């Protein structure tokens, strides 16, 4: 996330750009994931469970949407 302040650019804007760049990089998240060790099984489990959750969110709620609430 290397950044250079443009000529006649506000500081705050520059900071915002940097924050955006960092977010894009996923650096903080990267760090968080590497703080301590995750067992392979745990990693697998998380990935799978997340996928399951995603699929539920995609399909079951769509089905629910078809019917009106009131």
């Amino acid at each position: 996330p290397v950044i250079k302040v443009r000529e006649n650019e506000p500081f705050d804007v520059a900071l915002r750009r940097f924050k955006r760049s960092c977010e894009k990089a996923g650096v903080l998240a990267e760090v968080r994931r590497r703080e301590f060790y995750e067992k392979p099984t745990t990693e697998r489990k998380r990935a799978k469970a997340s996928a399951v959750k995603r699929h539920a969110k995609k399909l079951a709620r769509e089905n629910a949407r078809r019917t009106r609430l009131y």
Binding site: P1, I3, V5, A14, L15, S21, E30, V31, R34, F36
Partner: protein
């Protein structure tokens, strides 16, 4: 001491404590300050406010070097990441580059074990 116009700010932002270190462009450190050293302990030094005042202190320290331009490198995750640089800005330097300088391995060393809490 020799005056220098342009230099670096290295911001080591940990979870527990922030460390600001101003240096010349070559690598030689001019001054430094810390949240722990700014009189912040435990809960209090792991905060953005602690970090900004540490940054302010560091800025004060390198007054005699008469630095004007500055590029910043931000290391690590912490609260004193945005707050620190804002504080630095306020202290009245021309911020030139903001760089993120976290060490990310490409899956090298095994981290320590997960805490059980």
């Amino acid at each position: 001491r020799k005056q220098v116009s342009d230099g670096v700010a290295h911001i080591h932002a940990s979870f527990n404590n922030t460390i600001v270190t101003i240096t010349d462009r070559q690598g030689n450190a001019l001054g430094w300050a810390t949240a722990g050293g700014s009189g912040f302990r435990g809960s209090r030094k792991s905060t953005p406010f602690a970090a900004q005042v540490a940054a302010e202190r560091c800025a004060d320290a390198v007054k005699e070097y008469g630095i004007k331009n500055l590029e910043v490198m931000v290391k690590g995750p912490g609260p004193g990441r945005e707050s620190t640089i804002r504080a630095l800005n306020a202290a009245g330097f021309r911020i030139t580059n903001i760089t993120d300088v976290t060490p990310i391995p490409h899956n090298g060393c095994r981290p320590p074990k997960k805490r059980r809490v």
